[PDB]
Structures are given as C-alpha cells and as structure tokens.
From a paper:
Collagen model peptides (CMPs) serve as tools for understanding stability and function of the collagen triple helix and have a potential for biomedical applications. At the molecular level, collagen forms a right‐handed triple helix consisting of three peptide strands, which adopt a left‐handed polyproline II (PPII) type helix conformation and are held together by interstrand hydrogen bonds. A repetitive unit of three amino acids [Xxx‐Yyy‐Gly]n with a conserved glycine (Gly, G) and all‐trans amide bonds is observed. To further study the effects determining collagen triple helix stability we investigated a series of CMPs containing synthetic diproline‐mimicking modules (ProMs), which were preorganized in a PPII‐helix‐type conformation by a functionalizable intrastrand C2 bridge.
Using common SPPS protocols, the Fmoc‐protected ProM1 and ProM2 derivatives were successfully incorporated into the [XY] position of the CMP sequence Ac‐(PPG)5‐PRG‐PPG‐[XY]G‐(PPG)3‐NH2. [a] Peptide sequence: Ac‐(PPG)5‐PRG‐PPG‐[ProM2]G‐(PPG)3‐NH2; torsion angles were averaged for the central nine amino acid triplets. KGaARegarding the overall structure, the three peptide strands adopted the typical triple‐helical conformation, and no distortion could be detected, which was underlined by comparison of key parameters and alignment with (PPG)10.21 Considering the modified positions, ProM2 units were assembled in a PPII‐type helical shape (like all the other Pro rings) and were well‐embedded into the overall structure. In combination with the fact that all ProM2 units adopted an endo,exo ring puckering (as predicted by DFT calculations), a close packing of Pro rings within the triple helix was observed. The crystal structure not only confirmed the synthetic success of introducing covalent linkages in collagen models, but also demonstrated that the triple helical structure was maintained upon this manipulation. Because of their desired endo/exo flip the proline rings of Ac‐ProM2‐OMe were positioned in space that is also occupied by proline rings in a collagen environment. In fact, this endo/exo flip could be found in a crystal structure of the ProM2‐CMP facilitating a close packing of proline residues (see below). In the case of Ac‐ProM2‐OMe, no conformer with an endo ring flip at Yyy was found in the initial conformational search (30 kJ mol−1 cutoff), demonstrating the general exo propensity of ProM2 derivatives. A pseudo‐equatorial orientation of the rigid ethylene linker relative to the Yyy ring is sterically favored and thus controls the Cγ ring flip depending on the configuration at Cδ (endo for Ac‐ProM1‐OMe, exo for Ac‐ProM2‐OMe). Regarding the reference peptide, the stability was slightly decreased for the ProM2‐CMP or maintained in the case of the H2‐ProM2‐CMP.
Residue numbers in the entry:
A (entry chain C), C (entry chain B): 1 to 30
B (entry chain A): 2 to 32
The structure:
C-alpha cells in the first residue's frame, strides 16, 4: 500500500497591510 | 513495497497583516 | 509493505488583512 501522508505545509504568507487610520480638528485660533 | 504516501495537508493561514499607515483633521475654528 | 511517508503539504493561504492604522490634528484655525 501507499505510505502514510506527508507533513502539513508551512503557514501561508502574511496578510495585506490594513487600511489607513481614521485626526481631530486643529486648535482654535487665539 | 508500496508507493509514496499522499502529500500532507495545507499549512495554516499566514499571520495577520500589519496595521495600516490616518490623514489630518480639519483646521480648527476661528478665534 | 507500505511505501514511504509522502511529500510536504502546500502552504496555507495568506493571513487576514491587517487592522486600520493609528492622523494628526489639523492645522490651527485663523
């Protein structure tokens, strides 16, 4: 018969970079 | 004597991607 | 007798997309 199965493969590659983040209004003028 | 066994199963997913790179807010109100 | 243990499995899929990034305050008002 065939031999036993081989080993699991390696982890896949990293996922893509996330989306850009979301700043507040600037300071008031004096 | 028999032939090679089947390939192994797929690996797990890769790691989550890195965090993204936000824009400035609007100008402040007038004084 | 059985054959040899089999070849390596394939890589997993890509990981999930990253989270959103972290912006600055806007410019001061006039």
């Amino acid at each position: 018969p065939p031999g036993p199965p081989g080993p699991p493969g390696p982890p896949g590659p990293p996922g893509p970079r996330g989306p850009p983040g979301x700043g507040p209004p600037g300071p008031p003028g004096p």
